[PDB]
Amino acid sequence: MDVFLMIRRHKTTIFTDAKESSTVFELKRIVEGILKRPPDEQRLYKDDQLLDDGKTLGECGFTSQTARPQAPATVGLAFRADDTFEALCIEPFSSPPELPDVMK
Amino acid sequence: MMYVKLISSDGHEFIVKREHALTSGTIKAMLSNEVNFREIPSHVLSKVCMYFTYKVRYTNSSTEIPEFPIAPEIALELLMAANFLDC
Amino acid sequence: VLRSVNSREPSQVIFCNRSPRVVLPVWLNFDGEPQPYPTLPPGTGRRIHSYRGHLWLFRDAGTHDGLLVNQTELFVPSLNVDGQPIFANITLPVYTLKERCLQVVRSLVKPENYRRLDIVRSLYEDLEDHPNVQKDLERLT
Numbered sequence: 290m291d292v293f294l295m296i297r298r299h300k301t302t303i304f305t306d307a308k309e310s311s312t313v314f315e316l317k318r319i320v321e322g323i324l325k326r327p328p329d330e331q332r333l334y335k336d337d338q339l340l341d342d343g344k345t346l347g348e349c350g351f352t353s354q355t356a357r358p359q360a361p362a363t364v365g366l367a368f369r370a371d372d373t374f375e376a377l378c379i380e381p382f383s384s385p386p387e388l389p390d391v392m393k
Numbered sequence: 394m395m396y397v398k399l400i401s402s403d404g405h406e407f408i409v410k411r412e413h414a415l416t417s418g419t420i421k422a423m424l425s426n427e428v429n430f431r432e433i434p435s436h437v438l439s440k441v442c443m444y445f446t447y448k449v450r451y452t453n454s455s456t457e458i459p460e461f462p463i464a465p466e467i468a469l470e471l472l473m474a475a476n477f478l479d480c
Numbered sequence: 481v482l483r484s485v486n487s488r489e490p491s492q493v494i495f496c497n498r499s500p501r502v503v504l505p506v507w508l509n510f511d512g513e514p515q516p517y518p519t520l521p522p523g524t525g526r527r528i529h530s531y532r533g534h535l536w537l538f539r540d541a542g543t544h545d546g547l548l549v550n551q552t553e554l555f556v557p558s559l560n561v562d563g564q565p566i567f568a569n570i571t572l573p574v575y576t577l578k579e580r581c582l583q584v585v586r587s588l589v590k591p592e593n594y595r596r597l598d599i600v601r602s603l604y605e606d607l608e609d610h611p612n613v614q615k616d617l618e619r620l621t
C-alpha cells in the first residue's frame with residue numbers, strides 16, 4: 290500500500306510517496322537523491338519522536354488511510370552540520386487572511 | 394526520478410515530481426528546474442501541490458473517489474491560483 | 481437528438497450512489513426533456529424499473545454539479561442477462577481545481593454578492609455561470 294508524505298525541514302517541503310512496508314532508512318535514500326545529503330547526516334521524525342532506520346513506515350504510524358494523496362502525513366527532517374545535529378525546526382506555512390464579510 | 398522546485402511568495406520551497414507539476418500548462422511554460430511565484434503564498438501553494446497528487450492518483454481509477462477538501466478561509470486565493478495556473 | 485428510445489422492453493437497474501453528494505437522477509423523456517426523479521442520500525442504493533434504450537444522467541441535487549455513472553456522462557439500460565440487474569455506479573468526477581474552488585465559493589457566497597468579491601470580471605462570470613442540465617444537453621450534441 291502507498292502512503293503519501295510531506296518531508297519537511299526549515300522552509301523545504303518534499304512531496305513523495307513510499308510503501309507502507311518500506312523502511313525509515315530507505316526513506317533517507319529518497320531524501321539523499323533529492324537534497325544530496327547522506328543517510329548518516331539525516332534524522333527523521335514523527336512529531337517529536339526520532340525514527341529508527343530499520344523500522345517500517347507502517348510500524349511508525351504512516352498508514353495508507355492516514356497518509357492520503359489529498360491530505361499527506363508529515364515527516365520531520367534534521368541535518369548534521371560538522372560534528373553534531375541541528376534541532377528539528379519546521380517553519381509554519383503562512384496564515385490565511387480573515388474571511389471577507391460576504392463569505393461569513 | 395525527476396523533481397522540480399516551486400517557490401511561494403514567502404519563500405517556502407516545495408519539491409514535487411516533474412510529471413505532477415506539468416498538470417499546469419502555465420508551469421510547463423515557466424520551466425520551458427525552479428519556478429518562483431510572487432503572488433502565491435505557502436498556505437495556497439501547499440494545497441496546489443496536494444491537488445497534483447490527488448489528481449494523478451485518482452485519474453482513471455474505478456476505486457471510489459473522495460472529495461478534494463478546501464477550507465473556507467483559503468478558497469478565494471486558491472481559486473485565483475487555479476485560474477492563473479489553468480488547473 | 482438526445483432522447484430515450486421507446487422500446488417497451490423492461491430493464492431492472494440498481495442506482496448505487498458512491499459519492500458523498502445527494503444525487504438527483506434525471507431521465508431524458510421521448511422529446512428530450514429532462515425529468516427529475518426522487519433523490520438518493522450519500523452511500524445509498526435503489527432498485528428501479530427502467531427500459532432498454534432509455535437515457536439517464538446524474539447530478540448533485542442541491543447544486544446541479546455534474547456526476548459520473550459507470551465512469552461516463554450518460555447511462556443506458558441494457559438487456560438483463562440471467563435475470564440479473566444492471567449496476568449503475570454513481571461517483572464524483574475528478575474535478576479541476578478551478579471548478580472545485582468555484583463550488584466551494586458558490587456554497588459560501590449568496591449570488592447577489594458575487595460582484596462584491598475582489599476578483600477579475602471573468603471569475604465573476606464563471607461563478608454566475610453555475611452548472612445546469614440544459615447547458616450540458618446542448619454541449620453533448
Ligand SMILES: Cc1ncsc1-c1ccc(CNC(=O)[C@@H]2C[C@@H](O)CN2C(=O)[C@@H](NC(=O)C2COC2)C(C)(C)C)cc1
Pocket residue numbers: 486487488489495505507517518519520526528529530531534
Ligand atoms: C424510487 C426512485 N429513486 C430514485 S429514482 C426512482 C425511481 C422511481 C420510480 C421509477 C419507475 N420507473 C419509471 O418511471 C421508468 C423510468 C424511465 O425508464 C421512464 N419510466 C417509465 O415507467 C415510463 N414508461 C415507459 O417508457 C413505458 C412505455 O414503454 C414503457 C413513464 C414515465 C412514461 C411511465 C423509477 C425510478
